[PDB]
Amino acid sequence: KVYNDGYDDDNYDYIVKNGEKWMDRYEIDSLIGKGSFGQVVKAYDRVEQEWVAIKIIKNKKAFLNQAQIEVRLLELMNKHDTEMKYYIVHLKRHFMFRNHLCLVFEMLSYNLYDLLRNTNFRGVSLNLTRKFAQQMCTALLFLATPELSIIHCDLKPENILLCNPKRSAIKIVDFGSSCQLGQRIYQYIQSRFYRSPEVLLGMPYDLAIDMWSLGCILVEMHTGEPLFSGANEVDQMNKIVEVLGIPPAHILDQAPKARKFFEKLPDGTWNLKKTEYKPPGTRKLHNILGVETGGPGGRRAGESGHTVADYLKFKDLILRMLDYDPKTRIQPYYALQHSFFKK
Numbered sequence: 263k264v265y266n267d268g269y270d271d272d273n274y275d276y277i278v279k280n281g282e283k284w285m286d287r288y289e290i291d292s293l294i295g296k297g298s299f300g301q302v303v304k305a306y307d308r309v310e311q312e313w314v315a316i317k318i319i320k321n322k323k324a325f326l327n328q329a330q331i332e333v334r335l336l337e338l339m340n341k342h343d344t345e346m347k348y349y350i351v352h353l354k355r356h357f358m359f360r361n362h363l364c365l366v367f368e369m370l371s372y373n374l375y376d377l378l379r380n381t382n383f384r385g386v387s388l389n390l391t392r393k394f395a396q397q398m399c400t401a402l403l404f405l406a407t408p409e410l411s412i413i414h415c416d417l418k419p420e421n422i423l424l425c426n427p428k429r430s431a432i433k434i435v436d437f438g439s440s441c442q443l444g445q446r447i448y449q450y451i452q453s454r455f456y457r458s459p460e461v462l463l464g465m466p467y468d469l470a471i472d473m474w475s476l477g478c479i480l481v482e483m484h485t486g487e488p489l490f491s492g493a494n495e496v497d498q499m500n501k502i503v504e505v506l507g508i509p510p511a512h513i514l515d516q517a518p519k520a521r522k523f524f525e526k527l528p529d530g531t532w533n534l535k536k537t538e539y540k541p542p543g544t545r546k547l548h549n550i551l552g553v554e555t556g557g558p559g560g561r562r563a564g565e566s567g568h569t570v571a572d573y574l575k576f577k578d579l580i581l582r583m584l585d586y587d588p589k590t591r592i593q594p595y596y597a598l599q600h601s602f603f604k605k
């Protein structure tokens with residue numbers, strides 16, 4: 263059997279051969295990314311004389327359609343003249359090659375999960391976390407612009423990449439799961455660890471879900487471990503409740519999936535259903551962050567910029583990003599005005 267004249271495998275992924283040249287321009291070096299959508303490869307562009315990442319979409323209608331949306335959003339974002347756009351990954355060009363849609367991006371360095379792995383999952387400093395935090399809030403502010411109103415929908419450490427390995431500048435990648443503000447066609451969205459409560463509760467969602475994700479990411483970056491690492495959605499919600507308490511009554515009353523995690527008593531109050539968890543709100547972020555005990559695990563004790571005063575600024579901001587209510591949850595503009603960022 264042969265697929266796409268022998269260019270494709272059984273999955274209709276392009277069979278990548280190191281050293282291959284495409285259209286007398288791009289020289290394929292190696293495969294750098296693998297996904298349901300297709301593959302990502304590192305290539306040299308002879309014309310621009312630079313390294314580029316090429317996202318090779320699978321040769322199937324479904325995956326092509328998904329990527330077409332990705333392209334519109336990427337091109338829409340690149341359209342704006344604002345300087346905030348530079349925190350978003352830049353799509354240089356797109357083309358059809360051997361029945362595969364290919365997105366050409368600027369080559370980027372290690373993702374934030376790689377950084378975590380490199381620390382043996384013990385996290386990076388508050389100073390570097392602040393730098394990452396400021397850039398991400400700026401990125402979300404840009405996404406929040408009315409013309410765009412883009413929800414990334416899959417924010418996580420892996421999806422945040424450094425421009426250069428020796429600088430701290432970051433760019434958000436993978437808009438393949440992104441959508442614009444509108445009707446909640448998709449209920450099951452976001453990576454589980456970074457999934458907002460509104461999504462878990464099957465309620466309407468806005469751009470605030472990304473902000474929730476950011477809060478989880480920022481805590482994760484400093485500690486090295488996901489704030490909430492549920493094995494399932496129920497476990498996810500229970501892990502959120504451990505830190506933040508039972509969600510407010512006004513939310514759960516409106517929540518279609520409230521009874522998946524909670525039960526409503528005769529008095530009309532909400533409790534966790536029975537089916538190993540600390541009581542609601544007793545896994546304090548104050549202690550997770552090690553505000554008063556020299557940071558997480560005491561590894562930051564004696565380090566500049568790791569004072570109680572510093573940690574309290576970080577904690578307050580995080581707690582504003584992890585507001586249960588998406589209408590009151592801090593917005594990118596206000597987050598950038600937080601005392602955590604002041605000099």
Ligand SMILES: CCOc1cc(/C=C2\SC(=S)NC2=O)ccc1O
Binds near residue numbers: 302369
């Ligand atoms: C290992 C992936 O490395 C890169 C990845 C991207 C962008 C991607 S990957 C994906 S999946 N969707 C994107 O937009 C850009 C530059 C890179 O160096």
